[PDB]
């Protein structure tokens, strides 16, 4: 629910920061890297990921949305929870971590405390082609997200994009839907 | 609990928006149609439906209360959760979705990914009527408190007959004192 | 956790109001009576009781803590949830309802939809000795509140009230605590 | 998630207060002592600890994070919950409480209502060598341990960084140690 | 599900026994009194009440179903669980317990450990007009009510059947009343 | 798990029976109709349906498996639990209940206490073509049950049945699988 | 609920045995020591502890109640589950383990995989006063067991033991109960 | 808990069997291959895997322990539950399924309804090795108690060197006393 928190940095710890928004101070966990860029008494905005469990409600912040998204993705792998996800990133910056996950670098992953030889392999297997392996593609992802079949979702997207090129990613989606909604 | 969010649109994505209110940016999920009327770096407000679950708290936003209510009404149907409720709405605007249901159009609904012939019929069955001036609202509020329609009506008529031009709320509390009677 | 909501009234329905506090509009379920005193586009505050459940997070507003408290109390009774509780309060104001309870007027309680025969007796039995009837009394209940007995929560308090001529109920409490600790 | 609330004090009670931040009045539980320093109609800030359970979401306020942390720590003992924790802190101020715990003062703890002879002993066993009182190397190792690294390997990298970078910051030292650890 | 166990008594204890039915030794909890009548190495039968919880599956034995039913009934009172129920029945024999309850003997109940003044009162309020002691028409209506029919409609059909079938069996009367009710 | 219980009928009540198997007495809920056929002190076998919930474990018995299956089917409808299911059957024998559910007889269903106008409609809608509206069909049901697509499941079944007619329902299934397992 | 399983041994592995009781073969997890005394195709009995959890229902066998009991006891400690408990018993027989606990021999406890430094101290502290050191003592614990204090569970018992010359611990208990009830 | 059921086959259906043991008929789910070797009105025994869940307790039976274990091993894979585990086995006999996995044959597995290219690869990845004489079993039992392989081996070699022809169990307990050493 909480996608971001912007406010006065009240405290910069070694594994988190406290940002005050409208008098409310939110604790947001982060990596040294993300923290290093923060200074007490200054304003700051972090892109967060709110993770609610039965006995907890936690925020994890990052510099950008690309990174925050990467975190959420790490979470989708079996046996990889919030903490381990953060550790992976604390040990390997987003850019590297991604790289490793493409180069199937199992040696590198292992270094992250908590990731065994197998664990690393499951991570590499689960997301090598889900990190980085543009009008068109985005629109079909949107349609597949709404539950449409791929080789049909892309059929609408080509018709739309071809019938109208100047189309933005959003308008393109609206169009595809109108054709899929079968007028 | 959160019925709405008003703030600066920090980001307009393909399936949701981020609105900042008091330095807190809330992710509000929405349909492409709703998503269209929005612009980044602008002030905006979306009527929302906050769904609380064990491992999640998600917001779903719409242009008006009316639409946000139809959203919740879809959830009231067995088998239909938020994702599908949203998809149904993305494929059919509120106005149309309402007719498809009221009109019992199994074919149209089926065009929504996830809704099969059987599932479409259920929605048509359970919602057919469920899709849609002081007397009715007052008794409704009353029935909403467990009172029996008949008894609810029989106290509302009495009140509206007391004084006629009475706020719907005023007629309601007035009818309550009569029901806490003796 | 949320004790009160104060902001612009965005909508006033028959069983709830929406108060926008800092851009976020909270839905607050209230009684027609309470809802009566509220007009849209106006600033308003409401003492609330936040009910947290696995699949829900709901607010309940009232004019004062006096009523918000009774509400919470109604919920102390086995078999009584928020809907029934609000219903009860909608049929009888906090003041009166207390009377019905203290006077065990089961005939009036049953007037509330959802509360019948034994349901009322169950309530009358569970709430009488805690509905509606000084620096010393509190300070002791506060100690009894932290777990302290009474025989001892009274001696420490008497010790301090005779010690410090007579001042704040606060310092008397934290003073009785200091003794109770050594 | 909520680490602190700041706003107007709407009501000071004997076991809780109401601080109103941006229209929202949050109820935060505290000890007579913590409540003492507060005055209604005044703007005040309190370091809180948000405990979320299945049918409850509560705030517990304190004067500073140090005290707040003590509270969280009390909760780490089996059988010790929010209520008992507060009671403990209401009878013994934080300093006193840490003192007692480090000095196995079972007699003192037993005085707290609800805490018996055994409980006092478990607490003393649990908390004793774990109290922020009863400095760049240790912290950095602490964080490295926290991220999943073993004590040995952690010291090894922290020492290196410090020897190279004369003496600097826990932050930089941490970030630099993680770099080495990344192999 | 398990309503009774019958087999060799492997061990009579002070608060439970072990009856071995077909190789499986079931532990069933009971009162000193119920345990009295039992003798090790003897074949014995006990009417049980199986309480299944999330992390527990237990048996509670009694001399006859009547008593077993009383136990189940005690459990229908908010705040009253298996343990308290047993204790209640250990101090007061079933007859005595029903007596007390019907006679609002709050003094007697309060004697049971764990049951206070209030508890005794709730119990008396709850149980009192609901005790199998403190006959074909009533039962059949009882069953018809149990199946979801309202008292009025239920009597109406039961009377009919009985008037037609002079006087017969609760069974047949029930089956015949359900037929009419089926319209 | 428990599909049936055969033993000495220890007690015949108005809404259940107690059958003892190897010294263990199981309480099995049933309709008057099913009970009427039972007599105390006699042996008896009932086809049961064990329904386990977090705080309970119950058995529901019937004359045959066709009926027991009908019960399980009623359970698959939304808002229809064990009790209501039993009541439907207590009020309408299997044969009739089925009939009603085909003739969309909403009037009849309503009579069952607990089934409103809408409730009945959902039941009729959900299972009119799942009660009764043979080598071939059974084999495809088996394959669809294992997760196979219908219009492909039946394609294998025809090949098998045609290539070999004398086939039993079971052997026919084994065959289809071998062809679907793609040798 | 299942206190013991007696039947034909169908299989004897290294960490468990399968006893077929009346056609049903129950898997019973045991220690190599216990498993030692068992030979396939032979009749065997085993005192068990049935552990019921949401997604599991497991049995644990032992030679006697003495050990099955200690097992249950090990589980009374925070942080100790069935695996670790069995492991402990597999490394130290019930007798010895009791010694290690009573003598707080933390160096020996840590020999058990999964139990380290403080883990052992935690156990030593939680179990000593309940590990390994008459008609009157029991009867009183039995009353203390039903909730009775002690001051009173001792007087009623002394009253009856002096009343009835001296007989069954049973009748003494149900006799003390009869007094404690009037 | 229930490792096996032996009794009269009361019914042999298309996807399960009913075996009566002590007048209790248990529904044992099984594959068509296993289902074949069974005849009604005959005595039979199936090695089972009892899966306990909040709202269910289901039995799955097979011809041998070996096969029943492979069944549980499939469950250990993320995303694979009992239904699919059974389907996989119905489409591929234990022997073949083992090779398909060991051989990492994504194509074959994909023939199983429910197992896609991605899901097949996961199973191949997580089980590839997981599918398959006294030294190894003894250290394994030891490692099963948390002991470190190296230390486990270093105590087993010592024992097997004590006396050579020693039961695998005897070597195990013997190695344990050595590990509870000093």
Swiss-Prot record, chains C, G:
Region (Domain I) location: 1-63
GO molecular function (one): ATP binding
Coiled-coil annotated spans: none
Residues spanned by motif Acidic pin: 54-55
Chain residue ranges for the region called Domain III: 134-182
Membrane-spanning segments: none
Location relative to the cell: Cytoplasm
Domain II, as annotated region: 64-133
Gene3D superfamilies: 5' to 3' exonuclease, C-terminal subdomain (1.10.150.20), DNA helicase RuvA subunit, C-terminal domain (1.10.8.10), Nucleic acid-binding proteins (2.40.50.140)
Keyword Cytoplasm carried by entry: yes
InterPro entries assigned: DNA_helicase_Holl-junc_RuvA_I, Hlx-hairpin-Hlx_DNA-bd_motif, NA-bd_OB-fold, RuvA, RuvA_2-like, RuvA_C, RuvA_C_sf
GO-annotated biological processes: DNA damage response; double-strand break repair via homologous recombination; SOS response
Listed GO CC annotations: cytoplasm; Holliday junction helicase complex; Holliday junction resolvase complex; plasma membrane
Pfam families xrefs: HHH_5 (PF14520), RuvA_C (PF07499), RuvA_N (PF01330)
Keywords in alphabetical order: Cytoplasm, DNA damage, DNA recombination, DNA repair, DNA-binding
CDD domains: UBA_RuvA_C
Role played: The RuvA-RuvB-RuvC complex processes Holliday junction (HJ) DNA during genetic recombination and DNA repair, while the RuvA-RuvB complex plays an important role in the rescue of blocked DNA replication forks via replication fork reversal (RFR). Binds HJ DNA. RuvA specifically binds to HJ cruciform DNA, conferring on it an open structure. The RuvB hexamer acts as an ATP-dependent pump, pulling dsDNA into and through the RuvAB complex. HJ branch migration allows RuvC to scan DNA until it finds its consensus sequence, where it cleaves and resolves the cruciform DNA.
Family to which this protein belongs: Belongs to the RuvA family.
Binding partners and assembly: Homotetramer; forms a dimer of tetramers with an internal space large enough to bind the Holliday junction DNA. Forms an RuvA(8)-RuvB(12)-Holliday junction (HJ) complex. HJ DNA is sandwiched between 2 RuvA tetramers; dsDNA enters through RuvA and exits via RuvB. An RuvB hexamer assembles on each DNA strand where it exits the tetramer. Each RuvB hexamer is contacted by two RuvA subunits (via domain III) on 2 adjacent RuvB subunits; this complex drives branch migration. In the full resolvosome a probable DNA-RuvA(4)-RuvB(12)-RuvC(2) complex forms which resolves the HJ.
Domain notes per entry: Has three domains with a flexible linker between the domains II and III, and assumes an 'L' shape. The position of domain III with respect to the tetramer is variable.
Name this polypeptide is given: Holliday junction branch migration complex subunit RuvA
Organism of origin: Mycobacterium tuberculosis (strain ATCC 25618 / H37Rv)
């Amino acid at each position: 629910m909480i996608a971001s928190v912007r406010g006065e940095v009240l405290e910069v710890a070694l594994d988190h920061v406290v940002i005050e928004a409208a008098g409310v101070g939110y604790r947001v966990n982060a990596t040294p890297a993300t923290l290093a860029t923060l200074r007490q008494g200054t304003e700051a905005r972090l892109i967060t990921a709110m993770i609610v469990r039965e006995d907890s409600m936690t925020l994890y912040g990052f510099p950008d949305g690309e990174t925050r998204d990467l975190f959420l993705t790490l979470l989708s792998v079996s046996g990889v929870g919030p903490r381990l996800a953060m550790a992976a990133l604390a040990v390997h910056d987003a850019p590297a971590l991604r790289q490793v996950l493409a180069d199937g670098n199992v040696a590198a992953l292992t270094r992250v405390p908590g990731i065994g030889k197998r664990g690393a392999e499951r991570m590499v297997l689960e997301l090598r082609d889900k990190v980085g392996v543009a009008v068109r593609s985005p629109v079909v992802e949107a349609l597949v997200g709404l539950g449409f079949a791929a080789k049909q979702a892309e059929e609408a997207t080509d018709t739309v994009l071809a019938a109208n090129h100047d189309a933005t990613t959003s308008s393109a989606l609206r169009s595809a839907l109108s054709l899929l909604g079968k007028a």
